[PDB]
Amino acid sequence: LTPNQVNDELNKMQAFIRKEAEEKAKEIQLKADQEYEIEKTNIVRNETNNID
């Protein structure tokens, strides 16, 4: 409504915006750690069988 009240609404909104973006970015990089390991495991297994 008035300048104190619109700013109180602003503070809440960017808090949610920022938080959500942090979680979303976290899940993409958390899957990134994992996908690096599974893929590395497969590639390494195939070659070790050729070497063996």
Add this chain to the structure above:
Amino acid sequence: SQKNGIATLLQAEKEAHEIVSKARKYRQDKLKQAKTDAAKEIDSYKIQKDKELKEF
């Protein structure tokens, strides 16, 4: 402070996009590393094999 706040929110959604993209670039790179560090991982196991031939 109404139109000073709108400006802050349009920016925040842009930032939200960018934060997500930074992670999206990182994910693609981590996949390229998987192949390279797996290629380095095989020329260390080929010498581990050669070791036990020379031992023999």
Add this chain to the structure above:
Amino acid sequence: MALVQFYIPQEISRDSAYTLGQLGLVQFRDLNSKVRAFQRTFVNEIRRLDNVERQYRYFYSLLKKHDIKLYEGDTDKYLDGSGELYVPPSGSVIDDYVRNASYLEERLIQMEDATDQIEVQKNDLEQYRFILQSGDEFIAAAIGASVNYVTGVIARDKVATLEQILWRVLRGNLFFKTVEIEQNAFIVFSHGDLIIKRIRKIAESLDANLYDVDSSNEGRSQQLAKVNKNLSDLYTVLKTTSTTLESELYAIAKELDSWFQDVTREKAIFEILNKSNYDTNRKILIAEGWIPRDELATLQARLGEMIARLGI
């Protein structure tokens, strides 16, 4: 409290705000179609809008068939008695409401087609029951294929007269014509076994059901015993269908109405959000505010002249 959503252009922003103001609405912040993720354009919402129009269609399909009249009632608020009860204070769960209505439309279409298939078969066999009965009894040759009979129903004894003249001119007096008044008219022409097709052409052209045997249940001797057992299966099979029709009418008439009012509010939610590109360049403003829970009722009743609401 409940998050509330408003949409307008920026021309009546001020006149809208003031009026928002007077209903105890708080922390009114004007926004844009981008900042909140839900209120951001997606192709996903264009489909969602279609899923709601498929629900709307379904309601009409169902209402016709049950023989229960068109429903208008048009609520989206909790101030109204039926608006409160038939439209939930919690927001939409789109996947669910579609899933309830989809199944029933499907089950309903299958039932209806089957009911129609039963109804014609029953009405024809009960009819040709009597006909075959007469024509066989009239015997010791028409339980075989030794003599030829042409049983048939006709709805004009007048057109039957016309057929007797035709038959006689080109096919001689090989007809013996007998007639009984029925509930139709039972006609019978009786003929040789090598002129069979010749009489049929004539019969076909003036429209009669003159077939050599009018039922296909035949396979017990005499024909009439099989026809009677099939007609005992037919009669109960329509009944059972009716019982099924009833069960579904009791469960879903009230529900139908409650979905109809829900859907009105969902068509509104996609427009608010901006459901597609047309909507974007027509309503550039989307605003935010908080309405206390009791108050939430009088707010959606209010519909301005451009403003529609969704509450959660």
Add this chain to the structure above:
Amino acid sequence: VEKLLKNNNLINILQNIEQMDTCYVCIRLLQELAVIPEYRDVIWLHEKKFMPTLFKILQRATDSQLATRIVATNSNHLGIQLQYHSLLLIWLLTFNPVFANELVQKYLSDFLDLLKLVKITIKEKVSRLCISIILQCCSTRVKQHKKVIKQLLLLGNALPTVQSLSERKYSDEELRQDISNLKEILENEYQELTSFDEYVAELDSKLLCWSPPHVDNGFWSDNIDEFKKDNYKIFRQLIELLQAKVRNGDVNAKQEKIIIQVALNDITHVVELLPESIDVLDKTGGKADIMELLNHSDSRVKYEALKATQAIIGYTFK
């Protein structure tokens, strides 16, 4: 980590749902640990201690409304985080191929709950996680991945629920990806089984269930031709089985109910395609069975039965 899981005081602190503050932190402490690879193996060992509680947190979310701002597991900012953290902990053990096969097989009942969350939430934190975990378990790399899909799909009715969820989609790319990928995988695996193997396999085990490709109009048209070698011996096997179960052990008895509804559907499709199958129903005595199901209790029994009789009738007299 391994020691702490086994110890009582800490595990109890996760078990408490009477104090939100302890339980919230605890699930995150463990989850931060699961992120690091080595720890997953140790954590998995202690799995049947915290894991039902993580499902219980989602279950309470499902069963309660999403319009409460009082601190809970709902719409509230806390709630959105609380489901998220439990879901990340699961998602972490499911990335190991072995662990994923085991998870579906032990937690089966709870595993289906994931479909319920994807739906009821408007929140993309929850939805993305739920779909991803299911994807992880259906993947090629998971051992006996054919079984896990087969059981989810057939029993738990995964495929209809997934299809419906596909319509609802929200932000973050990986989410749209995971749904599309799931839809495709479920559809492909079921279908690739032969139509003749499928029917015969149910017929022997005396366990009959519906699935969408099973009831498909194409499946039936190819299969009519196959049954013949005795005047439609497979079809006849089906009629005999259906005949037995009505009389013996009743009908509208839980086990017996499943087989029936499936059988009455399965015969409807055959009956309609070719009318030489009409004779086998009249011969065996199975025609008489269909008539008694019409008045037998439940919507499905009478429904399925009415559809079965009406088809036989149509070919008797057109």
